[PDB]
Structures are given as structure tokens and as C-alpha cells.
Design a protein around this ligand. Sequence first.
Ligand SMILES: Cc1nc2ccc(Cl)cc2c(-c2ccccc2)c1C(=O)O
Ligand SMILES: Cc1nc2ccc(Cl)cc2c(-c2ccccc2)c1C(=O)O
Ligand SMILES: Cc1nc2ccc(Cl)cc2c(-c2ccccc2)c1C(=O)O
Length: 135
Amino acid sequence: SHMVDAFLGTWKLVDSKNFDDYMKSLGVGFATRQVASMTKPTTIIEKNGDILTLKTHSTFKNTEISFKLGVEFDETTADDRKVKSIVTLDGGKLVHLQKWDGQETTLVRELIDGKLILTLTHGTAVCTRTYEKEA
Ligand SMILES: Cc1nc2ccc(Cl)cc2c(-c2ccccc2)c1C(=O)O
Ligand SMILES: Cc1nc2ccc(Cl)cc2c(-c2ccccc2)c1C(=O)O
Ligand SMILES: Cc1nc2ccc(Cl)cc2c(-c2ccccc2)c1C(=O)O
């Protein structure tokens, strides 16, 4: 859509809250958390007609997903969960839902003041990750 166009580009992490707690909630062990916490990853968001691609680049792990809005797709996460995923658009918010093993976690991205804010939720664990556009 025209709402999606605003997310397009290269984004760099400049701040983080509760990410270690989030990973813990998912079951990521201390050793891996220490490593993933330390990194300051870059996320590339691109569009190719109907297909959105989302790339994360970092020393900890590189991941890439492509998908169409509203169409369920399989995903292997950075922490190696095999999940059923679906990305929707609620107004300004790009809402990513992952299901697996009777569990659910949401990854919401919205634009606020030219910054991309990613909110990762799993149960009581709520993580806020702030990105600045590189352009
Ligand atoms: C994050 C953490 N770190 C710990 C380190 C050491 C020990 Cl012994 C326990 C914990 C626990 C914990 C888990 C179940 C019952 C009670 C505590 C937790 C927790 O996630 O709740
Ligand atoms: C190092 C350690 N020691 C523990 C001792 C006891 C219990 Cl119950 C839990 C832990 C945990 C833990 C593992 C996953 C999620 C949450 C906590 C850890 C940790 O890997 O971070
Ligand atoms: C969205 C997401 N979900 C995750 C869930 C669990 C773990 Cl362990 C890592 C991630 C990561 C990630 C964080 C740092 C470097 C690389 C990837 C990301 C990501 O920002 O791309």
C-alpha cells in the first residue's frame, strides 16, 4: 500500500529496552542472549510489487523473509523457531504474528518521528527496539 512505502529502506538500531527479557521469555539461553543483546543490527525493508522482503544483518545472525500482506507463510526465526507467520497492516502499524508450539508472539513496527519502533511481545515480556533510518 501507500502506508507500507513509509517503512521502506535501511534501518539501524539505536536503542533497546527489555530485549534480553523478551528472548528469555522465548526460551533463548543466557549465552545466546548475551551475544544477541550486544549486537546493533541493521534491518532492510524492501518491496517488489506484492512481495515485501525484510532482511536483518548482524554479527549474531542474518535472516531474510519475503511475504505478501495477509498471506500466511512459514518462517524460521533467528533463534530457530519454526513458526507460522502472517503480516498485516493496521492503519500505520505493520503487525507480524508468529504462531508455533501452541504459543504466540507479535512483532509490531510503526513510524514515530521518522524513527522505526519495533515492539516485540510475548506474554508479559514487552520489548521496545528503536531504529533510525540510514538513507
Ligand atoms: C529468569 C530466571 N532466572 C533464574 C536464575 C536462577 C534460578 Cl534458580 C531461577 C531463575 C528463574 C526461575 C524460573 C522458575 C522459577 C523460579 C525462578 C528465572 C525466571 O525466568 O523466572
Ligand atoms: C543461566 C541460567 N540459569 C538458570 C537456572 C535456573 C532456571 Cl529455572 C533458569 C535458568 C536460566 C534461564 C534459561 C532460559 C530462560 C530463563 C532463564 C538461565 C539462563 O539461560 O539465562
Ligand atoms: C525480529 C527479531 N526477532 C528476534 C527474535 C529472537 C532473537 Cl534471539 C533475535 C531476533 C532478532 C535479531 C536480533 C539481533 C540480531 C539478529 C536478529 C530480530 C531482528 O531484529 O531481526
